Amino acid sequence: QQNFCVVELLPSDPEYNTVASKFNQTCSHFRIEKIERIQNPDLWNSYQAKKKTMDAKNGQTMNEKQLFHGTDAGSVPHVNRNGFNRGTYFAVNANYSANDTYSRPDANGRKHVYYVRVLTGIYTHPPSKNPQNPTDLYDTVTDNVHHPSLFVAFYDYQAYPEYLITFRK
């Protein structure tokens, strides 16, 4: 259970182009080896379930964002099956996740950054909305509320690792 499939995208595919564009906004100086869509039905269903309840709760809020997460090659099979379970940091701009401390170059100089659907929801600088009602907390935290560059999720199934980007210098 929570099994997955890994589908490589053709650079001639609109879906590859979409992911690449966003990546190249801050990382056009890197070369992309490949992009793969991670298909994990049970992780996706858990994520959508949490999104349904979140959309019913946060009103006019656009709860979802697409953010980056750099990681070592060793971590790929874990993320693919488990998502980002047991907080976890995500970047607005790809170049931040492209730092060698997050996405280490493997033996061949290859670097790995996920492009993640994250349920950011309502967020602040896992704290509570009202200290009088400490059961209803904030969805994520960020570094800056008006000009965010990073978000941190805590609860499971709050982030779906849709695409994997393999690239090099």
| Burial bucket for residue 96 (CB in 10 Å: 0-12, 13-18, 19+) | buried
Sign, Cα dihedral of 69, 73, 75, 76: positive
What is the separation, in whole angstroms, between the first and last Cα of the chain? 37
Of 86, 91, 98, nearest to 126 by C-alpha is 86
Stretch that binds ligand 91J, among 24-32, 36-44, 55-63, 94-102 (CB under 6 A): 94-102
Taking the complex as a whole, the smallest distance from the CB of residue 109 to ligand 91J amounts, in Å, to 17
Q: To the nearest whole angstrom, how small is the minimum distance from the Cβ of residue 13 to ligand 91J?
A: 25
| Structure token digits, residue 117 | 């659907």
For ligand 91J, which is the closer residue by CB, 17 or 95?
95
Output 23 or 96, the one with its CB closest to ligand 91J: 96
Q: In one letter, which amino acid is 102?
A: Y
The binder of ligand 91J chosen from 19, 54, 116, 150 (CB under 6 A): 150
Is residue 161 a contact point for ligand 91J (CB under 6 A)?
Answer: no
Residue 72 in contact with ligand 91J, rule: CB under 6 A: yes
Q: Where does this chain bind ligand 91J (CB under 6 A)? A: 69-72, 75, 89, 91, 96-97, 102, 150
